[PDB]
Amino acid sequence: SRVIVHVDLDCFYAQVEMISNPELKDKPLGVQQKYLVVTCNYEARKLGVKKLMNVRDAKEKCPQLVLVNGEDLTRYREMSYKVTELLEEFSPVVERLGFDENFVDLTEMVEKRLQQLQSDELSAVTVSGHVYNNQSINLLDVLHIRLLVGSQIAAEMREAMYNQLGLTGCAGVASNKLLAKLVSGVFKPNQQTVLLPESCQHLIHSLNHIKEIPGIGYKTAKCLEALGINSVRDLQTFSPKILEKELGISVAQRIQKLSFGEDNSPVILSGPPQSFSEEDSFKKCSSEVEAKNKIEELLASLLNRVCQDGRKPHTVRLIIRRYSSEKHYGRESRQCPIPSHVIQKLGTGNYDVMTPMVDILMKLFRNMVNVKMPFHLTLLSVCFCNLK
Amino acid sequence: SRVIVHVDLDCFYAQVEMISNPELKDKPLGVQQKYLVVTCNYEARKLGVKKLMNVRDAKEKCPQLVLVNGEDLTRYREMSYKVTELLEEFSPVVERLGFDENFVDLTEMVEKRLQQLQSDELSAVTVSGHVYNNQSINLLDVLHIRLLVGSQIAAEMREAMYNQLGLTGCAGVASNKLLAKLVSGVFKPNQQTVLLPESCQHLIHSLNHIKEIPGIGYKTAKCLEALGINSVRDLQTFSPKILEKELGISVAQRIQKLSFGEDNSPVILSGPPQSFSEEDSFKKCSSEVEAKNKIEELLASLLNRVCQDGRKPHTVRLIIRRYSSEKHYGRESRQCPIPSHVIQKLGTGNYDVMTPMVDILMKLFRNMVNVKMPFHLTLLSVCFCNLK
DNA sequence: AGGGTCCTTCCCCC
DNA sequence: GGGGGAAGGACCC
Ligand SMILES: Cc1cn([C@H]2C[C@H](O)[C@@H](COP(=O)(O)OP(=O)(O)OP(=O)(O)O)O2)c(=O)[nH]c1=O
Ligand SMILES: [Mg+2]
């Protein structure tokens, strides 16, 4: 009964770099972080198997591949909220997912539009964009009409996004978040797709691995595998009772519903930010005692954000992880309710505030006792988080 | 600037029993939990029954000692919220602490009374109850007048509590929560005491051990004892730096401040419960076998409270504890999500879920998993934790 | 690489 | 019985 739209922008970071420097346009571009080509424009994703997640390693394919550093997220973040606000203008309930994805619940909006339609030209409702599996529309099917109207809102949102902000992107319209997200990616470049109910199974079985299902990460994908479960149908037909008594009645019942294209999670209002953090890294270069000056830097930038945006962090930490072969995690981080007075004027010219963050950041850091001394580490972050 | 009142009822449970069964008011009474005297009135406390164990012990030393069972908390919990609601009527910001204590921030109320007061009847203001250290009042001291007005509201709250609910209790009036709670117990049975600023140190140094300070339990008392800190003054004078480097910068600063009677924590509006837990402890009533039936009971009662409350529990918890020496450390717990659309049902067959909670608790209970010692360390404990 | 948002364990304290 | 601080997970994008 719900009409949800999932908006996913094209190579977001690359798009923000091109809009700020046309001389980069129509030129195989990739945005680089430390030693990572986080993403690149389409005129490169084909120009050398240059996809996301690769590094200078992928520069191999036509090294004429331009590069721009994308470590500072400031500009991406700002454009990201502009997209979200623009979307919130069409309808208030908008959920963010990373900096370039937005879920929008259009149910109420779609309905108001249909009501305003006389019982005469409601037979002229057409679709905007693609119909997922070239599925035939049935004008007398109330659910088809609502999703078509939904495709119309999507096209208006993408038009607005392009005309007002200069950004292109994809959109997917379906009856729930899972489906909307899966279908928004069927026609990748700058297009949109709507999913009619009769094609839900076709979309779900088009996936090659249960890992491709939104809501099934690296971990659970591993558990299921140990049970032989590899394909979407494997999960659809697996024994409920056993999966339940294997991952928990809560998770078991949820992930299995997803294998069928069922997902009742509501689109959540992703009102202002809940935490700010600035992490600066040195790729595994920490000696354990000579990192401290960096803390004075990365946390240095945060203040500028907090001061810019109101409200203050009544919390802090630093997050660290020791990585090796396989998986990542960490037992690094120290939090404390910062000083009342400091928290109330974190923009009145004081920088002595850093010393008190440094004492709790690292000298009051590590573990119980004094004994052995092994170092190793990989990049670390600090959170300015709970925010009230 | 702040005026806080701490309300603490006299032997709450015994008092609620004495009201239900009137013929007990003149006979020494103690309330019994499964074989431990949780509390007793001031007619039996005279013989000195400081919440001791084994009824028979004190029973034989008081032949006319008629005891009642206090395992079912339903009645106490109800009377407990009648108290809070009555207090919320005087002023909205009311914080609960257990079933018999309530903090109320009277700051705004006191001022309203002062401003509404004339410029002549300002020298007429008098105290209600005891002045802590028999300290002289200075009418021209704004802090004094405001605390005296606060003692006026405390007497009215105690009076209303007796006339409307039949309960007596003590009240403490001070400038923060720590001091309000310390001074409310100076004159113990059914009386109130206000603390003027000049006597704060006298009140704080009247304690015989740093663990008597509200906010310092067993754990901290021990970590302080190992540092050569036993008296309140030992803590006021201890080196900050060393303490910070020992307990953390946040606890260090907080714990030490309390040593001087400084406590800035705001009175928190408790509002309706957040949880609906029911813990059944038992002196070794069973091993591994038949908890299914225990779950059926603990969860059964919770289903009438949840229904009467009007809200639905989106998470269920369960914490286990095992037997250990000296302090009985028994912290142990697992928690998870709860089913939607079925579980929060209203239909006459709402109880069928019983089997779901059973499984759901069993997988959490087993994750503590027979391999540690975990089975039969103590009884059961459930929480319906988180209600919206 | 950056930069977030829920969960979850304790651990403490009346 | 009932609250909050911690800290890391596990997904994210
Ligand atoms: C996934 C992933 C994304 N990103 C950044 C890079 C992208 O610009 C931005 C958006 O995430 P994505 O949408 O997955 O990347 P994309 O928009 O560049 O690719 P597409 O055109 O197919 O939608 O967030 C990260 O920094 N790290 C990550 O691990
Ligand atoms: Mg994208």
PDB file of N, CA and C (backbone and C1' of nucleotides) and ligand atoms in Angstrom, chain A residues 6-12 39 42 45 52 99-101 188, chain D residues 13, ligand 2:
ATOM      1  N   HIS A   6      13.536   5.606  -4.133  1.00  0.00           N
ATOM      2  CA  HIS A   6      14.926   5.574  -3.695  1.00  0.00           C
ATOM      3  C   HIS A   6      15.709   6.373  -4.727  1.00  0.00           C
ATOM      4  N   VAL A   7      16.371   7.428  -4.255  1.00  0.00           N
ATOM      5  CA  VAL A   7      17.159   8.293  -5.107  1.00  0.00           C
ATOM      6  C   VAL A   7      18.636   8.013  -4.866  1.00  0.00           C
ATOM      7  N   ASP A   8      19.345   7.712  -5.951  1.00  0.00           N
ATOM      8  CA  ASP A   8      20.751   7.363  -5.888  1.00  0.00           C
ATOM      9  C   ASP A   8      21.501   8.133  -6.966  1.00  0.00           C
ATOM     10  N   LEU A   9      22.351   9.050  -6.544  1.00  0.00           N
ATOM     11  CA  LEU A   9      23.087   9.869  -7.482  1.00  0.00           C
ATOM     12  C   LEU A   9      24.235   9.157  -8.178  1.00  0.00           C
ATOM     13  N   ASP A  10      24.520   9.625  -9.385  1.00  0.00           N
ATOM     14  CA  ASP A  10      25.592   9.072 -10.195  1.00  0.00           C
ATOM     15  C   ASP A  10      26.947   9.520  -9.656  1.00  0.00           C
ATOM     16  N   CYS A  11      27.889   8.579  -9.555  1.00  0.00           N
ATOM     17  CA  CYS A  11      29.248   8.857  -9.099  1.00  0.00           C
ATOM     18  C   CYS A  11      29.291  10.200  -8.371  1.00  0.00           C
ATOM     19  N   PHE A  12      28.614  10.261  -7.223  1.00  0.00           N
ATOM     20  CA  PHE A  12      28.472  11.490  -6.454  1.00  0.00           C
ATOM     21  C   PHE A  12      29.704  12.382  -6.328  1.00  0.00           C
ATOM     22  N   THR A  39      35.826   6.506  -6.157  1.00  0.00           N
ATOM     23  CA  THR A  39      34.844   6.492  -7.229  1.00  0.00           C
ATOM     24  C   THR A  39      35.350   7.294  -8.422  1.00  0.00           C
ATOM     25  N   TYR A  42      31.457   7.913 -15.141  1.00  0.00           N
ATOM     26  CA  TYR A  42      31.171   6.837 -16.082  1.00  0.00           C
ATOM     27  C   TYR A  42      32.081   6.814 -17.299  1.00  0.00           C
ATOM     28  N   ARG A  45      34.469   4.274 -16.022  1.00  0.00           N
ATOM     29  CA  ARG A  45      34.045   2.981 -15.506  1.00  0.00           C
ATOM     30  C   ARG A  45      34.080   1.958 -16.637  1.00  0.00           C
ATOM     31  N   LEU A  52      34.520   1.297  -8.738  1.00  0.00           N
ATOM     32  CA  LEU A  52      34.747   1.824  -7.399  1.00  0.00           C
ATOM     33  C   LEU A  52      35.542   0.851  -6.531  1.00  0.00           C
ATOM     34  N   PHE A  99      26.069   9.671   1.886  1.00  0.00           N
ATOM     35  CA  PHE A  99      25.925  11.013   1.336  1.00  0.00           C
ATOM     36  C   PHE A  99      25.173  11.140   0.012  1.00  0.00           C
ATOM     37  N   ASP A 100      24.872  10.029  -0.656  1.00  0.00           N
ATOM     38  CA  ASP A 100      24.201  10.156  -1.949  1.00  0.00           C
ATOM     39  C   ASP A 100      22.939   9.360  -2.178  1.00  0.00           C
ATOM     40  N   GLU A 101      22.362   8.812  -1.118  1.00  0.00           N
ATOM     41  CA  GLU A 101      21.128   8.051  -1.263  1.00  0.00           C
ATOM     42  C   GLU A 101      20.044   8.634  -0.381  1.00  0.00           C
ATOM     43  N   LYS A 188      21.365   1.959 -14.695  1.00  0.00           N
ATOM     44  CA  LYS A 188      22.411   2.704 -13.983  1.00  0.00           C
ATOM     45  C   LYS A 188      22.753   4.155 -14.200  1.00  0.00           C
TER      46      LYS A 188
ATOM     47  C1'  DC D  13      27.480   4.721   1.734  1.00  0.00           C
ATOM     48  C3'  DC D  13      26.487   3.988  -0.345  1.00  0.00           C
ATOM     49  C4'  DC D  13      25.467   3.923   0.781  1.00  0.00           C
ATOM     50  C5'  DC D  13      24.667   2.639   0.807  1.00  0.00           C
ATOM     51  O5'  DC D  13      25.526   1.515   0.700  1.00  0.00           O
ATOM     52  P    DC D  13      25.047   0.075   1.164  1.00  0.00           P
TER      53       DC D  13
HETATM   54 MG    MG E   2      25.456   6.450  -5.782  1.00  0.00          MG
END
